[PDB]
Amino acid sequence: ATSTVTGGYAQSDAQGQMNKMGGFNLKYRYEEDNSPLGVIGSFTYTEKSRTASSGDYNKNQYYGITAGPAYRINDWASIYGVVGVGYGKFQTTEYPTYKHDTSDYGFSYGAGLQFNPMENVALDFSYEQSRIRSVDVGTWIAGVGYRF
Numbered sequence: 001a002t003s004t005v006t007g008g009y010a011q012s013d014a015q016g017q018m019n020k021m022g023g024f025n026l027k028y029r030y031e032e033d034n035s036p037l038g039v040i041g042s043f044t045y046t047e048k049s050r051t052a053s054s055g056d057y058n059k060n061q062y063y064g065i066t067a068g069p070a071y072r073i074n075d076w077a078s079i080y081g082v083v084g085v086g087y088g089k090f091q092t093t094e095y096p097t098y099k100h101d102t103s104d105y106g107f108s109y110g111a112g113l114q115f116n117p118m119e120n121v122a123l124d125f126s127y128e129q130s131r132i133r134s135v136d137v138g139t140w141i142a143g144v145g146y147r148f
Contacts, residue, residue, distance in 0.1 A: 001148045004029035006124065008143025010044060015135050021046050023062075025141055027124075029070065031148075037069035040080065062088045064108060066128075078114035083107065086130060086137075106130050108137070120146045 010023030027042045046062035066084025073079065086108050090101040112126025122145055130137035 002031040004031075004122075004145050004147045006122075006143040006145025008124070008141045010046075010128075010139050010141040012046065013138040018135070019048065019051075021048050021062075023047070023139065023141070025143060027143060027145065029145075029147075034072075037071060040068055040070055040082065042066045042082070042084070044086075059090050059093075060088055061091060062086060066108065066110065068110075070114065072114075076113070076115035078116075080112045080114060080124070080126065082110050082112075082126070082128075084110075104133075106133070110139075110141075112141075116145075116147065118147060120144055122146065 006027040012021040044064040050057035064086035066082045068082030070080045087105040110128035114124045116122030128139040
């Protein structure tokens with residue numbers, strides 16, 4: 001009741017001399033009447049398969065937490081806007097100790113369309129933009145969920 005479970009897949013665009021990335025997203029939503037908006041929170045984790053040479057594989061991970069108000073249109077015209085914080089960090093494989101890891105945060109903004117009936121048959125699609133340092137992020141997500 002008054003809860004939603006959605007899972008989706010994200011693809012992130014690569015800048016020249018780089019590779020694409022994949023992300024998994026989980027979302028929770030609260031059910032609200034017309035006059036208060038619905039609250040959605042999403043957690044995203046980025047992953048990349050190992051690359052040639054074991055010197056640098058899946059070293060970099062990205063974490064993002066976003067929150068925003070959904071507006072429910074009875075037609076398939078629903079509008080959601082969300083803002084989050086995303087950061088990247090390098091983690092040690094296990095034993096090889098070194099002091100080269102770095103961390104940086106950026107602000108992401110996204111918008112999506114939503115059409116939902118009861119049960120799993122509700123779908124949402126959103127695009128997210130990360131603000132432009134020497135690498136710029138473009139992410140498209142598609143998720144499916146159910147309510148109560």
